[PDB]
């Protein structure tokens, strides 16, 4: 998912803390990007 991953890059702003505060986009996009849906808690990378 090169363009997957792409916008972890756009919507890291979430992962740059959390993401309950701006989890709206990536809402579904964190759940193709990522599977793991820890994105900041990244417990399964």
Same mark, same amino acid.
């Given at each position: 998912g090169s363009i $997957?991953? +792409?916008i972890d890059r756009i919507t890291e702003r979430a992962e740059d803390s959390g993401n309950e505060s701006e989890g709206d986009q990536e809402e579904l996009s964190a +759940?193709?990007?990522?599977?793991h849906l820890a994105?900041? $808690?990244v417990d399964d990378l």
């Open positions: $997957d991953r +792409l +759940l193709v990007e990522r599977g994105p900041w $808690d």
